């Protein structure tokens, strides 16, 4: 058995405040003897609009460097290793700007106990949706990724990584299992409407489809994305402020048979951590008994 | 603006004549309820005791199908009203199969129109070869030969129909292909086990519905099956010890909208045959696809 921690939190537009929360969760995870901690999409910030995101993305590299230092500090202080999977934003590179692509990068970092970034997964499927009872277009601020993420040989086993919308495209999850995934993660900032309808369904489905443990770290609650300093500098009227967002939470861990084995406590309000012990022998037993990957029709599909 | 579907739940025996009677009653009920199409489960002609039994019964299936074709035209004529029928049956191996040393039966999903014309015979692609958790070892491939073709989209009275069977549901790329080809409605006629049914039946149907943004129809076998066949047991020189033929199906037949909402579901208080009805809404389906345009947002540059 190996221990995973899944974090649930509520990002503001203040990267400093968000970093403090992130650090506390990582510290809690080490104290609870988790070997890896998984944090949601956009753990560095959430923004009011594309202009705001571009402004905040400039601050993200410092957030990441301070986080790297904080992990090595926490590991050394507690005398125990932990790896961190965390959703952040990155600003466009110098080359991107020259090519006329001034969009930010929605990225999932895997940072090991040495504070080294082992992977930077850039979100492949962008959330451009008329949410059933606001009209969202992530591609107005965000640039899509160019590559399928490699499987990570984590302390928990073979890990396949994805972000939010990615979960809705089953071919991605299937590919990660084909590449050797035993564990999938979907750090997310889900809406209330789609969360109530599909969050648990999609997580359990991916787990059952792929015979993988599935980790679902989610943003939760009502966000306050106000940023007086940005609002002043860009000369905003209060009428064009868009600082309210709300996220579904219900962060969970699902076993390869679709059983929810850990779930966020709905009665606790702030950031929270959930723990699960993962069983490699149960995973192997499920795959042995129902050998889906020996039964696919690759000749046709 | 709405189109009515009927989904049948039944309990097949090894007796093709008895099974036909039940199928005929359900189709009759569907026409009376003004369903445009009726969907029946996998193995609606028969279920068997073992691979040898299946091969023996499959020889009787062509007669079953001809009688069914005739029954449909008779029912259409007598009610002055059209219906199409989707039904899981078995078929014996072809001469070409036999020449290749393949005497296994075909697990096929038939689409039959109101004139009794067979429009499609989809031969099941993925076969149920699994060790059931706290259950029996099952190997469909011992009795059944896997298909070699992706089923064409059927332009049914309800809309564009993508067809699959049972175990096919567990392979998301199949349902994804059906939607890519233009499906608006998916069907998974099944004979699902108790153990896997309790765990995954509702999950898989709802998942496929929301994955593909299609209506999903799930006609299921239900109950403890009577696989008794005295004349065949005699012919096979089967002892009473070998005669213990136990099989049980999950049922819980349902219809699911493209958002994953269950809109019709079998009554759990019946273990016998029953029909459920649903009105399918084309506007809702198109609305969902418009608001979340998944098929405009895939990464074919990476997956394929
Ligand atoms: C019994 As036939 C040859 O119409 O499938
Ligand atoms: C043919 As006998 C009744 O001896 O098994």
From Swiss-Prot, chain A:
- What is its quaternary makeup? Homodimer.
Q: Which parts pass through the membrane? A: none
Q: Which GO terms describe its molecular function?
A: [acetyl-CoA carboxylase]-phosphatase activity; deaminated glutathione amidase activity
| Catalysed reaction equations from the record | N-(4-oxoglutaryl)-L-cysteinylglycine + H2O = L-cysteinylglycine + 2-oxoglutarate; N-(4-carboxy-4-oxobutanoyl)-L-ethylglycylglycine + H2O = N-(2-aminobutanoyl)glycine + 2-oxoglutarate
Give the EC number(s) listed in the UniProt record. Answer: 3.5.1.128
One cellular-component annotation, GO? mitochondrion
Q: Where is the CN hydrolase domain?
A: 2-280
Question: Which InterPro entries does the record cross-reference, listed alphabetically?
Answer: C-N_Hydrolase, C-N_Hydrolase_sf, Nit1/2_C-N_Hydrolase, UPF0012_CS
Similarity remark = Belongs to the carbon-nitrogen hydrolase superfamily. NIT1/NIT2 family.
The protein's name: Deaminated glutathione amidase
Main localisation: cytoplasm
Q: Where does the UniProt annotation locate this protein? A: Cytoplasm; Mitochondrion
Q: Might you name a Gene Ontology BP term for this protein?
A: amide catabolic process
């Amino acid at each position: 058995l190996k221990r995973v921690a899944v974090a649930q939190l509520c990002s503001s537009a203040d990267l400093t405040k968000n970093l403090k929360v992130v650090k506390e969760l990582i510290s809690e995870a080490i104290q609870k003897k988790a070997d890896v901690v998984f944090l949601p999409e956009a753990s560095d910030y959430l923004s009011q609009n594309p202009l705001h995101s571009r402004y905040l993305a400039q601050k993200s590299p410092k957030f990441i460097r301070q986080l790297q230092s904080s992990i090595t500090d926490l590991v050394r202080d507690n005398s125990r290793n932990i790896d961190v999977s965390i959703g952040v934003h990155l600003p466009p590179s110098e080359q991107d700007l020259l090519e006329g692509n001034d969009r930010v990068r929605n990225v999932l970092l895997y940072i090991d106990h040495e504070g080294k970034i082992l992977q930077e997964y850039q979100k492949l499927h962008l959330f451009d949706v008329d949410v059933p009872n606001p009209i969202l277009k992530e591609s107005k601020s965000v640039q899509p990724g160019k590559a399928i993420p490699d499987i990570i040989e984590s302390p928990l086993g073979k890990l396949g990584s994805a972000i939010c919308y990615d979960i809705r495209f089953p071919e991605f999850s299937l590919k990660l299992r084909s590449m050797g995934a035993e564990i999938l993660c979907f750090p997310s900032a889900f809406t209330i409407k789609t969360g109530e309808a599909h969050w648990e369904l999609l997580g359990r489905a991916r787990a059952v489809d792929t015979q993988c443990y599935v980790l679902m770290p989610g943003q939760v609650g009502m966000h306050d994305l106000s940023d007086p300093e940005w609002e002043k500098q860009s000369h905003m009227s209060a009428l064009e402020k868009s600082s309210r967002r709300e996220s579904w939470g219900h962060s969970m861990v699902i076993d390869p048979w679709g059983k929810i084995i850990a779930h966020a406590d709905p009665s606790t309000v702030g950031p929270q951590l959930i723990l699960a012990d993962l069983d490699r022998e149960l995973l192997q037993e499920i795959r042995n008994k129902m050998p889906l990957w020996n039964q696919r029709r690759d000749d046709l599909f």
